[PDB]
């Protein structure tokens, strides 16, 4: 259960369910003890391993196991104690694990109340004939334990609860499969955190959300207009949609591009959306295959970088054609020396407001060019300059969302450029965040692969669970060596 809750948080309609069914068949597990085990697995998560975004994924998986256990109650048992008292004795049992909930509350600072709310949610979903009295009796032991202190600081709304509550209205956000509406519906998304995406991770809206934004992108070809305000609004809308798509890709990836390219007779720009960052380089591939750049708008980016002074008219073609931009950049920076310091000026001009895809293309082409000897390292300094705080309202940036946009740019730069931030010198920490993704290779360089046993297996045998975090490591170990050895 930890394994499945760590790899595929979404896209889990019911592979997990049939897997539990088969392992129950191929074993001797009493249903009360089985539901006890799954609930213990849900509770043990979100505590040890994660400290950031992954915690929302964990709570989403926990509150997604509820329709799972509902389908289990529906189709697993039949005519033999059909969930009459199993959940009752299971909850009674797990109530004896008071220190577990104590540690959970100490961790989340609101888990004690959140436990009550999730119990009421389960009751609203599962059987709730008279087990509310059991919840009351359990709270009668829980609450007195907690009536110089951590309560003084946290008095505001609990982040897991607000998310799981507002998920209802998030699935029914607008119920408008169309476009040309107001940006306000999305503007509120710029103020809030990825809580929307966290709720979407419950597989209830992720597919539909991806489809909606895909249709918005494929539809917003900006027609032929001249309303500067409306054109800038639509440009910012497209930018925010692409940022959200890239964030969903960084989070889960395959499922979103699959939901976007499952059926239909069309061909949107799925190339720059499926060749940006993944466990596959495809570096020189971009100069090879997608480099079909006719003379049409071939010098468009050139004239733009020459006389930007960049958001005159709505046009998004340089995304699939920034190859000429990167070529000019490398040829002017140090390869031929066409511009000593004017390269930074041209980069700042290309870093104008309402333009975030340009940074994505720049990072992707830096990742493509890192395949060299690293003796030039021009793209490294280029990306460093691009990631800076340069655009401090220099141009007339009519965005008003530069904060969230810059945060998305930073997190996307963080998820990619991993190899460049590894194969070269470490960056000067342009993050200024809170806690980046801790999950990484974590493979001791000056140590062989012959360490899995004495470092993982002995511990996990002495421990009580599979050490979910280390599991990630195991995954890297899997597709690195051979299954045989």
């Amino acid at each position: 259960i930890l394994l499945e809750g760590t790899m595929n948080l979404t896209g889990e309609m019911q592979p997990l369910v049939e897997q539990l069914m088969m392992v129950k068949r191929m074993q001797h597990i009493p249903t009360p003890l089985f539901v006890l085990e799954i609930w213990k697995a849900c509770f043990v998560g979100l505590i040890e391993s994660p400290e950031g975004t992954q915690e929302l994924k964990w709570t989403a998986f926990t509150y997604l196991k509820i329709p799972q256990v509902l389908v289990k109650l529906k189709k697993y048992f039949h005519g033999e104690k059909d969930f009459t008292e199993d959940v009752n004795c299971a909850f009674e049992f797990l109530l004896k694990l008071t220190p577990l909930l104590d540690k959970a509350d100490q961790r989340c600072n609101c888990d004690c109340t959140n436990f009550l709310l999730q119990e009421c949610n389960k009751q609203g979903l599962l059987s709730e004939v008279n087990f509310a009295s059991l919840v009351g009796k359990r709270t009668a032991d829980r609450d007195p334990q907690l009536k110089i202190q951590p309560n003084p600081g946290l008095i505001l709304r609990a982040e897991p609860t607000v998310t799981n509550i507002l998920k209802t209205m998030d699935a029914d956000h607008s119920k408008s499969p169309e476009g040309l509406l107001g940006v306000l519906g999305h503007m509120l998304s710029g103020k809030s955190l990825d809580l929307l995406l966290a709720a979407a991770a419950a597989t209830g809206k992720l597919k539909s959300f991806a489809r909606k934004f895909i249709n918005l992108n494929e539809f917003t070809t900006h027609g032929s207009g001249e309303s500067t305000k409306t054109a800038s609004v639509r440009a910012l809308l497209f930018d925010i949609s692409f940022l959200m798509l890239c964030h969903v890709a960084q989070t889960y990836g395959s499922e979103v591009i699959l939901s976007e390219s499952s059926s239909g007779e069309e061909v949107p720009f799925f190339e720059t959306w499926m060749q940006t960052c993944m466990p596959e380089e495809g570096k020189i591939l971009n100069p090879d295959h997608p480099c079909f750049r006719p003379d049409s708008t071939k010098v468009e980016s050139l004239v733009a970088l020459l006389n930007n002074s960049k958001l005159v008219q709505m046009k998004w073609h340089e995304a699939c054609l920034s190859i000429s931009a990167a070529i000019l950049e490398i040829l002017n920076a140090w390869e031929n020396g066409v511009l000593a310091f004017e390269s930074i000026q041209k980069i700042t001009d290309n870093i104008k407001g309402k333009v975030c895809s340009l940074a994505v293309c720049a990072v992707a082409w830096l990742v493509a060019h890192v395949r060299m000897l690293g003796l030039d390292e021009r793209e490294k300094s280029l990306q460093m300059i691009r990631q800076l705080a340069g655009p401090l309202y220099s141009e007339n940036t009519l965005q008003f969302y530069n904060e969230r946009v810059v945060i998305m740019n930073s997190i996307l730069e963080h998820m990619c450029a991993d190899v460049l931030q590894q194969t070269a010198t470490q960056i000067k920490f342009p993050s200024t965040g809170v806690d980046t993704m801790p999950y990484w290779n974590l493979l001791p360089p000056k140590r062989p692969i012959k360490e899995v046993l004495t470092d993982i297996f002995a511990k996990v045998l002495e421990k009580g669970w599979v050490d979910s975090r280390s599991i990630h490591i195991l995954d890297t170990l899997l597709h690195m060596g051979g299954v045989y050895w």
Binding site: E92, D102, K103
Partner: protein, 357 residues
């Protein structure tokens, strides 16, 4: 009592004369071996005497205190207001230094000048310094002190991390070894009072499997850490280091207290685990008490036999007693247990048949 008015003057003129040795533990422990039960009222004047006794501690300038100064500052104005509750957390901080004795950064400015005559074979001896005189002024001793010392176990302290609780309990036992009788005797009564008997007799839960619960190192996982089990280790904790003469306390502590509190069998396994793994200390020194421990074992057996529908874990108790007999009692108690072993259940009789020899 007016002798107080005398003593406070003496050091006030000869305090600095103390700059040659500092061992107030052996110099103060005897002063409260049985005075507490009658010092309470006079302890009000001790509310002054502590400010005199710590004054003797004030005659030392090695720069060796950086956190007890918090207690000092919070114990200088309106002493009858502040230091009651938060001391618990403070205690953690204190025992923090203890668990900071091994790998942390405490071996920095704490020890100095010159690890030669300042009683420094191990900084652990610095722990017992204030523990007793902390709140002996008010009615804090007797019960509240023991509860405070044990709150570090049953309740999840914020600073307390769940990967090294072993060393924590070890340090708690190390401290406990240097406290007056009632402080560490009230602990036993609290343990056996309700923890061993919450309900535990009609039907506790399906968790009634004794072995998985009563065994430690289960805390290595974020589950299977029921409070009661913790308390178990707690006992072990002090008995991990107080195993010199304190064990003479448990026979009496058994003979009455453990008798009318046990009905089922897992309570028996619990009290067994509590008393069991120490028979070597009796075979070595307290030979007279192991017979009492054994007759207590057999009394628990007769009690669980008389009040039970059927024994579910027969063979565990069987080979347990087999080990205890063949390895520790030799051939001494053979007669006395007979006067109990004959009146057992027929099944249990056949099961323990070979105890006759």
């Amino acid at each position: 009592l007016p002798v107080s008015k005398s003593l406070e003057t003496l050091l006030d003129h000869l305090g600095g004369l103390y700059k040659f040795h500092d061992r107030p533990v052996t110099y103060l422990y005897n002063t409260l071996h049985y005075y507490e039960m009658c010092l309470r009222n006079r302890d009000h004047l001790k509310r002054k005497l502590v400010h005199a006794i710590i004054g003797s501690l004030k005659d030392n300038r090695p720069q060796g205190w950086c956190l007890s100064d918090t207690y000092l500052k919070h114990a200088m104005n309106a002493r009858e207001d502040n230091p009651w509750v938060p001391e618990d957390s403070y205690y953690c901080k204190l025992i923090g230094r203890l668990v900071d004795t091994m790998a942390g950064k405490s071996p920095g400015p704490f020890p100095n000048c010159d690890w030669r005559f300042n009683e420094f074979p191990n900084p652990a001896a610095h722990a017992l310094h204030v523990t007793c005189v902390e709140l002996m002024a008010l009615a804090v001793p007797g019960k509240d002190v023991g509860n405070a010392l044990l709150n570090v176990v049953l309740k999840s302290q914020p600073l307390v991390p769940r990967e090294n609780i072993t060393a924590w309990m070890n340090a708690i036992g190390l401290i406990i070894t240097a406290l007056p009788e009632p402080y560490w005797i009230v602990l036993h009564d609290r343990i056996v009072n309700v923890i061993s008997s919450s309900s535990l007799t009609s039907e506790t839960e399906w968790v009634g499997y004794p072995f998985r619960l009563f065994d430690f190192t289960a805390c290595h996982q974020s589950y299977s850490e029921m409070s009661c089990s913790y308390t178990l280790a707690l006992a072990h904790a002090v008995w991990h280091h107080s195993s010199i003469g304190q064990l003479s306390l448990i026979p009496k502590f058994l003979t009455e207290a453990l008798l009318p509190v046990v009905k089922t069998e897992f309570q028996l396994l619990y009290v067994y685990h509590l008393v069991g793994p120490f028979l070597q200390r009796f075979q070595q020194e307290r030979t007279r008490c192991m017979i009492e421990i054994g007759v207590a074992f057999y009394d628990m057996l007769l009690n669980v036999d008389q009040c039970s529908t059927h024994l579910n874990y027969m063979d565990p108790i069987c080979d347990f007693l087999y080990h205890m007999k063949y390895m520790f009692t030799g051939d001494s108690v053979k007669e006395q247990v007979e006067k109990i072993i004959c009146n057992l259940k027929p099944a249990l009789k056949l099961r323990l048949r070979f105890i006759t020899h």
